[PDB]
Each structure stands twice: as C-alpha cells, then as structure tokens.
Symmetry: D2
Subunit: 247 residues, 4 copies
Amino acid sequence: SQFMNLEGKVALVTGASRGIGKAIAELLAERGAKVIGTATSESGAQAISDYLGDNGKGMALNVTNPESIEAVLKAITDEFGGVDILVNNAGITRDNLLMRMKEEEWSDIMETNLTSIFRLSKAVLRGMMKKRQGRIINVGSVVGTMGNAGQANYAAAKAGVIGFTKSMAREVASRGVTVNTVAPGAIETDMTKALNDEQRTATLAQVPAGRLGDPREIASAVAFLASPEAAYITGETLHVNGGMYMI
Amino acid sequence: SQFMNLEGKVALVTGASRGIGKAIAELLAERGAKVIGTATSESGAQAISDYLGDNGKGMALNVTNPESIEAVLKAITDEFGGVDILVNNAGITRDNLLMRMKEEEWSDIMETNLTSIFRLSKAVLRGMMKKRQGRIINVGSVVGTMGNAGQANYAAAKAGVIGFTKSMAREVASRGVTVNTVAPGAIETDMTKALNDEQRTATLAQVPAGRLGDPREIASAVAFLASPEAAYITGETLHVNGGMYMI
Amino acid sequence: SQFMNLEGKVALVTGASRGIGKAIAELLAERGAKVIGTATSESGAQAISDYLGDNGKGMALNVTNPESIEAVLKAITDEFGGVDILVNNAGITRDNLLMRMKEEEWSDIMETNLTSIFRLSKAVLRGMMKKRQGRIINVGSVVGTMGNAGQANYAAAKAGVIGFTKSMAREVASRGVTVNTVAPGAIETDMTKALNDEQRTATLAQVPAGRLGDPREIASAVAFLASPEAAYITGETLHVNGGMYMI
Amino acid sequence: SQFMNLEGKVALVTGASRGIGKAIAELLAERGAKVIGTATSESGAQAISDYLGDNGKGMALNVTNPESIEAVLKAITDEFGGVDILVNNAGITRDNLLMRMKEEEWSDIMETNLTSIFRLSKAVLRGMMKKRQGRIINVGSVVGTMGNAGQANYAAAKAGVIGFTKSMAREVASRGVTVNTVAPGAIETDMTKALNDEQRTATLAQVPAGRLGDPREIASAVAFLASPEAAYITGETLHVNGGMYMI
C-alpha cells in the first residue's frame, strides 16, 4: 500500500551489523527503501550485504574519520542517489563511575556518540535541503533523558544529540527536512544477554511493561519517523521504553 | 501486509464526524480495524456510518453522560466484541483570558476534555486487562505542554490528560495495555479556516515547518501507537507540531 | 537584609494547618510577609493565628465554595491590602486503582486540587495585574510529572495545574506577575508517618538522596519563587524530590 | 540570619570576570561564602580579586587544561579548604548554521562547554563525597532545552551538560552532594548589548516577560541551589527565562 511506503528513498543506517541497527535496516528495506547499512569492518559490511540482498548493501564506515564518511557518501550517491534517510545508530559505551572514568573513556564516547552525529548529519544535509525532503533519525537512549549512574559520559553524549537535534530541526524545518531522536529503553541485545540473572531481574524491575524491548520495536518507531506520514514531526524524542521513564 | 495491521481489533474513536477524528477513524479502518466513530447527534452518527461503510459504524455518544457511555459500549460489545483501541478525540474549546473566563467555561472544558477521558478509559479498561491487550490513545494538544494565553482551561485539561495517561500506563503496563497521548500542533481544520489572514500568518510564524498540519498526519501517529508494533511505547506523549515546540 | 525580603507583601497560603502548608506560612512570615493561612475549620484557623502571632492570621476557607473565597479575600483586602503572593497548597488524595475509583473520588480531586486553583488564582489576579506585581505559586507533586499507579486522579489534577500555570504565565508575564509550581517528592508528613516500615523502605528506595524531604525544604523553594529575586522565573515547575525524578 | 547562609562554604565560580559569573561570585560572597572566581588571564584574576576583596580571590584557570585545574584546586584547598560549591559558568559560543560550521567550531565548544564540566566536576567531587556534602551547579542555557538555529554546537554541549548532571546526581545523591543546572534565557550582557536594535526587539518578542534578564537574577537562582535549604533538589534544571520556554 501507499501507507508508510519508503519506495524511492535511500536510507543510510550506521551500525547495522546486529541488534537494533540490523532490525532498522531490515524494516526500512521491507517498507521499500534502498538501504545502505554500515559496519566498522569489511566483514561486517559483507554480513549486511548478505542480509539485505537486492534491497541494498553493506559498507565499511569509520564514523570518527572524515575521509571515510566522504568516500562512503560518494559511493552511495553515485549508485543510489543522495541519502534521503539517515539513521545514526552507531554508538559505544565506556562505563565507569566518575571517580574511575578516564579522560579517554570520556573523549571516545564524545567522538563516537556525539561528534559522529554532527559530522554525518552535516554531510547528508546539503542534498536533503536541495531536494527539500529528508529525514535524520538519531537512535538515542532513555539514559540521555533519565541519566544513569556509571554512564555519565554516555548520558552526556545522548542528551547532547537531543540538543543538536532540536537546533538542526529549527534550521532545516522550513526546507522539508525533519530531525528526530528515537530513545530506546532496555532492549534485548547481546549486551543484556551478557548480564547476570540478578542484573536482568533488576533491569526488569525498572520496567512497568515487565519485559525487555525487542529490536524490532525500535525499528518500527524509526520506520514511522522515516515515513512521508511523519512529515509534521520534527525536533521530537520518541521514547520506546516500556514505561521505564515517562516525559 | 502484517505491518501495522489492525485486523481483528475493535476501535472506538470519539468525535469522529470531521477533521482529526474523521481522519483517525478512516485510517484505522484502512489498516483493518472495525471502527465505531461517535458524534453528539444521530445525524452525525449517520455521516460516520456513511463514510465507514462495511468497516464499521457511527453512534451518538454524550461523553459527559454515564448512561450514554454504558449504552454505547453495550451496543459495541454485543455486535463487535469488546473495545481493543480507544481513541479519545472528543474535545471542545471555551477560550477566554482568565479575568473573562466564566465558571461554566472552566467546568465545561474539565468535563468534556478531562473527566470524559477518566470515564471512557475506565469503562473500556476491564475488558482490555482481562485480554491482557489494549490501546488507549488520547488526542491532546501542544497547548497542554506549551500553555497558551486565553486557553488556560483547555491547557489544564490537556495537561491533566497527560498526568492521567502516565498513571494509567503504570497501572496497566504489566497487563499488556498501553496508554499514550498524541499532541497535535496547529492542524488545518474548520477552526483554522475560520481565522482571518493575519491570524493564520501569526500561527504559521510559530511553526518552523512553515505550514499547518494535516488531519491525516495526526491519524498516522494514532495508527502507529495503536499497532502491535508500538507495544513497548507507553506513558508517552507523541508531539506532532511541525517544530512549534520541542521537548 | 534586602535579600529574599518579603516585607510589604501580603501572602495567602491555603491549607496551612500543618506539614508543608505550615512550613510555608512560617517561612514567608520569617522573611517579612504578612501571612494569611487557611484551614477548613475555625479551630484550624485559630491554630494558624496562634503560630503566626503578629505576622498574620488564620482564616477558615472552603476552596471549593465561591462564597467563602469572596468572603476571605474581602476580609484580607480590608485589613492587609490585596494579596501579593498566593500559595495554593490545599489539596487532598482519594487513592484507588482505576477499576476501583469512584466518580466522586475523581471529581473531588478535580474540585479540590485543580478547579480550586482556577478559582483562587482568578480571584487574586485582577489586583496583581493592576499593581503590575504578583506571585502565584502552586504546590504540586512529583506524581503530576511521573504519574503513579493508584493515583490517576491526583496525577491528573497536579499535571492540570502545570498546564494552567504555563497558560496563566503567558497571559500575565508582561504585567509583572509570575506563575510557577513547586513539585515536592516524598516529604515527611503525617501521611508518610502512617505508613508501615515496608512502605517507608519502598518509598526510600525510589529516592537517590536516600531520605524523605522535610516540609521546610518545600517552604524554602516557595519562598524563593515568591521573592523579588525570582522575577524572571515564570511558567516553571521547580522539582524538590531528592532525585526521585529528573526532568 | 541562618536562611540561605553560605558561611563556612568554599565556592569556585569559573568565568567570573563579568556578567553572570561576576554576579554569581558577588552574591555567594554576600551570603558568606569564601569565593574563588576564575578568569583565563592573570589580569582577569586580579579584577576578580579586586571586586571580592576580603571575601575571596581571583585565580587564572584554563578549564581545557588538566594541569591548570590541578594547580588551582591545590591552591584553593591549601588556603581555604576543599571546594564545597562548584559553579561551572565558563563557556563560549562559536555560532554558525550547520553547513557553515567548521570542525574546530564544533570541537572547541565541546571542549570548553562540556568536557570542562566533566573535568572540573570530577576534580572536586572526591572531597565533596568524603565530607558527604557538596553542590555542583552548571550554568546552562535555555538553548540546551529549546534548541536554536545557528547554535547546534552550543545547544549540544548545554544539553549534554544536563545528561551529565542527571547521571552524576544519581551517582552521588546518597552521599549528600547535589548536582543541578541553572538555565538562563536571554540575559542582558555585553553579547546582547552588541546586537542591532532589530535583533534586540526580536529577542524581546520571544519573551513573555517583555525584557531581558539581569545577571543578578541568574545569581539568585544559583545561590538558592547552593544553599543548605536546597539539599533535596538534585538532577534538576532551573529555568530562568522570563517565560521564553516552559517545561
């Protein structure tokens, strides 16, 4: 149908090897987007090419390196046309209580989780603004809004992405580009599977819904914001957290 | 497809004669819901029956009267089965600066815009909680979050609906019911069409997107939250306002 | 000193017999305000007169009855001059899960916790707007922002007060009146003292600060917003909750 | 009096040469704090020493340099005792629409406005946590919450400080340290005085209060949060913006 139909759109999904990023890339492809998913390695890129088949391809991308960004965007533009949907999903953690947090743990998080968003967003915006049509969707975290002990760095970067997102939204709204954040709660991934039974129970205790989210549930929220139907949503943070926090 | 598919769901949409409510009811039917839309009069009810055809029907409902609520729900349950999706869209305005605002203008807004949501929500929840599956979606307003001079009553009631929504979300999350609000900005309707040129220009000036929203844009957000795919979204307020306010 | 000095201001504090309301009234008097505190009974009114001594007096007030409001304001205006600071602290709870919540438990909360604020605010505003100087301060609750199972009514009314506050703030800002809410978390009062050990431990577990708040802590926040120094704070909700929720 | 009395507290106020920072340092001294204000130059440090007289002193501090931080904190601890109140007020702007924003304009803002807060906060926290008593107060901006076109970098850093603040609040709440942000709106400073008449009118048009804030109004909000009376406020953002934004 014509409902939430992404046929004709080119989507770049960073960090698409697994979990949330993979669910996003698959669902955008299922709704008809041409999808380029990225990984930090060539092997990862191949795994992405494998799951996307004819609906797109995987590319190696170093989100902290300007030259890589330019090379990947050039390859995309040449084959598929300019990027219509950017999903910034790449991100890491470097957890530690503040008194134990190293300078490098702080600066790696800023680089990978916040500065990357500045760089990639800037790199795709010009084309979107010329077409007067675009979507930038940041995959954030409930931690950016709630805060979390032991994650002051991750929380800082995720909250920073929201301030960036609002400002960019204001800059580009009149030219038909929307900029939003999807903020997952506790989602079932490799990270949550690596927890103790006691830590899993503690996580679930914070969730009124009484379960972890599925990566598909994050993908659905992203696909929604990516759609023509979400044109009047901008500068928004869509929380998908099972009631863990309510704004 | 199986994406955002409401086949098998019974949806009650209050205030569905026109504009936003009508767009909601049509889209839910398009996605396969059986839809009961309401109006305050029988002729309105018939207009709704006319546009829904085989996908549902219209009923007369006084959202401030307990007996009417019980009669409408009984008729729905008997023919279609219990309500799976409640969209609380019925709502009025009674604008005035506070020094000019009559007791009755305050109380009518409370009754129609806030207490109605308590009554209807309570009336459908028991069945939802037994099935361990349900959606309650309130159509709010940016005015609930931003405030607006001359609409202290409307703002109070819409903000009140958010407090209710968050509490109810916490009560019923573990039993598979979600409760959320969609908060429209300035949407093109009969009300906005009744404005003079200067007032329309003033409204547009508050919108980064540089246009009014379409009722279909509110409907899309409602359909999204109504879907199986939005199961992990609860106690949330989804803003659809073209950047008029950014939370 | 001239810092946070309320000499020359007339303050009406509703619900001032004990706990938070009493702490507010005492502190405003300490900072030099002339304070009228209210209770629902004459004996309560006398208790207030007793603790205020020469710094003010107690009056019986039914915050749900127009005639009582007019009588109390007339008596205040005649003796002290018009109200400069209104603190809306009067408020009740009628807790129940929604399926158990009676019509009257809903409506009593609306009446006492939300509609009262409309009535009193409206009744003092005209004088404030003529002087181009005023403070309206609502004592809310963290429950208005967070929601709470079993308190959907109380949450609705407190959230409603915030929507009202923001709209009124916008109406009256240019005429030198501020309108704000102080939102207490779990504060040590008779209510919290009536809890068993297990319920107190459960409350404390939700508070990063690891203790209940003191009523004096709410009073200090109210005194701050009441001061000349807070003239540029309006439409704000000041959370005093030990980290129980972070906006 | 004993109300909002900072006697016995050592306060470090970064960026205290003028405007907001100067008003903060003066008011903390007026409430009895021993105040160390910082500037980036020795001459600035002397200007601060001059205005603080016997109530404190000025020190040169490079907030982007670890060695300087350690030297300044050692000098403070040796003479005054460990820092009880940190106010992070130092900050710059590097404005540009995203398509014009240089890598260095992005990275200078991150360094000076966000990473500095990580470094200085970390450097004073240990002592505060041992005493089980402390205040960290970040001077943010309405731009961090609202976003602003042409300031995506500044907005990112200020919003980031809020995510950091919430996380740190959660880490240290049980040890009697509070962490908060004061978020000024449009305040009268050298920056606002450098604007066109047309830009000043445009700024005022966004402010319901109809005027710019005074730096003293920001100082008062900071002094409040710094006080013993604000012990139950943590992880909060106190907006002081004349109604320019309402959360």
